[PDB]
Amino acid sequence: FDMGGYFIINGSEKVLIAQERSAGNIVQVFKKAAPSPISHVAEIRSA
């Protein structure tokens, strides 16, 4: 019944938890706050 998908480090069963993040190479436009001098910012995280 053991499904696996885990490692064995020093006899201890370890599980790598999936890490959530923002996708790269995506263009996103954001409205800045009121006290801010800039009104809009179109940014992109290049990977």
Partner 1 sequence: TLSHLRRTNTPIAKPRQLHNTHWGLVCPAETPEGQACGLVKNL
Partner DNA sequence: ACTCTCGATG
For binding to partner 1 (CB under 8 A), which residues are involved? 3, 5-6, 15, 17-21
List of residues contacting DNA (CB under 7 A): 9-10, 12
Among residues 8, 46, 42, which one has the least CA distance to residue 24?
Answer: 46
Query: Considering the complex, what minimum distance in angstroms separates the CB of residue 44 from DNA?
Result: 30
Q: Quickly list DSSP for 6-17.
A: -EEETTEEE---
Tell me whether residue 13 or residue 43 sits nearer to DNA (CB atom): 13
Among residues 21, 26, 18, which one has the least CA distance to residue 45?
Answer: 26
Which option in partner 1, DNA, none does residue 10 bind, with CB closer than 5 to 8 A by kind?
DNA
